[PDB]
């Protein structure tokens, strides 16, 4: 309830700014959560950082279940801004782990702006070099509707994932399920089918 004072500054600039902001965020979240275990652990967390880093998911999920509609709206807006606005590897990893831990819970994935932000999150995934999450996100994208762009994204992500056979299967599916010869030769380029490209 007292915790909105920490986000709506919108003035953190460099990597250290956001590290300290996350640190104080965890301190606030862990200090008051109405559960004695985490409340006790907070005081030591003030002294030791890594243990608090390992415990972010618990504090977030605990406090979230007590946050109400509008306050959760503020939280998700602020967290989306922090995601799309920053590029440091550690914080992106923190957010990705947070989301993936939510999606295995029973309360469902955290609702983002649009389709749980699965397009946005995958966007961030490639740049932090965590690629299995990227593939799984592209899977979630694919089940809805097949489009050429996502197919090429699959081709590229499998290529960097050292799995040529997945790329060959994507190619076969593209020929026999789209089947309009929209295939631009750069597809074969990535597939190393040089004769086809010729």
């Amino acid at each position: 309830i007292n915790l909105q004072k920490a986000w709506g500054a919108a003035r953190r600039v460099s990597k250290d700014d956001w590290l300290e902001w996350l640190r104080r965020l965890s301190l606030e979240l862990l200090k008051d959560s109405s559960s004695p275990s985490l409340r006790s652990c907070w005081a030591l967390a003030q002294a030791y950082n890594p243990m608090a880093r390992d415990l972010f998911n618990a504090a977030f999920v605990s406090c979230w279940s007590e946050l109400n509609e509008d306050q959760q709206d503020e939280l998700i807006r602020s967290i989306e801004l922090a995601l799309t606005s920053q590029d440091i590897a550690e914080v992106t990893q923190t957010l990705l782990n947070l989301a993936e831990f939510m999606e295995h819970s029973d309360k469902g994935p955290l609702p983002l702006r649009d389709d749980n932000g699965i397009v946005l999150l995958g966007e961030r995934a490639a740049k932090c070099r965590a690629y299995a999450k990227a593939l799984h996100y592209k899977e979630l994208e694919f089940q809805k509707g097949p489009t050429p762009a996502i197919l090429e994204s699959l081709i590229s992500i499998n290529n960097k994932l050292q799995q040529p056979e997945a790329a060959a299967g994507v190619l076969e599916y593209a020929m026999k399920h789209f089947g309009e010869l929209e295939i631009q030769a750069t597809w074969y380029e990535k597939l190393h089918e040089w004769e086809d490209a010729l």
């Binding site: 993936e100 295995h104 299995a132 999450k133 593939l135 799984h136 899977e139 694919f142 089940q143 699959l154 994932l161 799995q163 056979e165 997945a166 060959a168 299967g169 994507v170 076969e172 599916y173």
Partner: protein, 672 residues
Amino acid sequence: QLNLQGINESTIPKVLQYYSAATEHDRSWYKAWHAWAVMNFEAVLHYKHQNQALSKTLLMYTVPAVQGFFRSISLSRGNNLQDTLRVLTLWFDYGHWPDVNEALVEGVKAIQIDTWLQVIPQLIARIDTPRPLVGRLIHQLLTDIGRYHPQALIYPLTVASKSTTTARHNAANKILKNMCEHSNTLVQQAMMVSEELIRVAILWHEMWHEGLEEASRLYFGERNVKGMFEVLEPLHAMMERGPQTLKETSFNQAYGRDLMEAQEWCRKYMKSGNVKDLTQAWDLYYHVFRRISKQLPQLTSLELQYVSPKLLMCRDLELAVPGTYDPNQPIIRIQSIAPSLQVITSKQRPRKLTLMGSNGHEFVFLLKGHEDLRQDERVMQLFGLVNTLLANDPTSLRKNLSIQRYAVIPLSTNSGLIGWVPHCDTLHALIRDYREKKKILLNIEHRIMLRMAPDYDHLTLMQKVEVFEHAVNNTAGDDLAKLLWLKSPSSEVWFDRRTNYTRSLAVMSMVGYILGLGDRHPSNLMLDRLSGKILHIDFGDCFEVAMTREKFPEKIPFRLTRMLTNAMEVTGLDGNYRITCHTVMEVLREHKDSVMAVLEAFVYDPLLNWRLMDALNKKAIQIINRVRDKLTGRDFSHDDTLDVPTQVELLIKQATSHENLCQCYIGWCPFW
């Protein structure tokens, strides 16, 4: 030249002299001797196959082959099972000939000893030969093996000792008695343990239950007093020697009066034929059956103190842990046996036995009765062979293809011990657990199928197809993928496990097809929750028997349903699956000789054809040819030869064709 013209009396001398020249030109080259001996044996096979539409020209062709096989193993030195199998079969076929006798005797003493470890079971099945010479050679060879390596021989020998036929058991007694002189206490200890823990397998009253369960059907279907006499005589034969433990004594106390008066009545009958006697004996037997059958389900736990007083008081022994014994590693002796036996409820009631060995490491096992396991040993050896084949190839080895295996040891004619794979899980429980967790009914597909049509099981195939599709498309089958992903710690290992699952499933599918494996219901398959690999069991229905049975004859090569399909990869089955299938089929097709020889040794055993034979070897021949067509690409019609991709695609289309999936047995779960 052989690929050009095939075989005739004309090309044979030319290729013979070609290869002999090659040998004389290298003399130190495995491949040359290999080709020479193979060609000699093939010519012998031809000349045997032609004459039935002068055994000396045959003989002069055979002897050089044998010399070649001996020469070849002397050069192989690392993995040579195939050549050994061929020399063993030539031994068995023409070992009576005096001219064969020498070549064999120099070859056997010339070669090293450990080489026979790969064929120890195969020899023992033929110990009951009808020819004195071959049997004598067998005796010397086995004696030598035992005196050098006792442990790798003791278990099947004590198996053969407690046989039923005369020559088998008496030859077994002769060899075993020759064995004890240098090592006796081991023989006593093993004999005690084997003859004891077999009693734990089939307890007295279950055995009696099985006997009468059989005899009732026998009498009511065949009207043969004699058949049921042989059925239930040995039970009394073992009865009258007296109980030995508390459980058997209690059984006697309960039932023995009835059990012996029925016997006196049946004897009274067989003296003078008139049903007025045996009616009473049958009524008493059936009363006993009703009494016994009321309590079988309650049987849940056994304590050794009540069942076998001798086992729990060992506390040390000289046997290695059965089934795990390697010539290149020091043995691990069995240290103790736990006093508790847990019974897994089923129609077969296997026991969960546990031992503790020398180095403080547990060995959990599964004690099976009521079954044969000898076929399983041979198929496990074959799978090990194919694993070796995949081991030595660069394109496959980078992709990490193998078949996970487990320990198998046959203890007697109708019981044995199977290793327990840790962390494994039956697919049936997985879908069951996930569905009950989401509060979803188990057999929803079947309920829908019955709701739209009650007489589901009598419709015509097209009607079955219409309803089958209407059922499947009505329920979005995606359970396995969500199940697996929810059961993953992190996404990366999730992807790795998915990869492993795909690759493992493909190779097992192809090998199952090439074998003739059947009955792939979701209770016969298991998954490793740790590595995600796939595991097969229940190797009883082999050589395409199930596709030739009468009731519910399956028309599918192997299991590939939507639940396996959708959960594997987003594109479908045209990703990893097809490419790995290509690779594996090629690798198999290029060593056709090895697998062909191993399976040929499999089939020809006179004591394993009981399941599949109900001249006399004609049906055997008729499967064997099929196997070669499966390696030759001539299955659909042997007048043309497709490539690997064509056979692969035709098999794939066969597997996932709706019109075929409808005909399967309902419990097979085609809807999954």
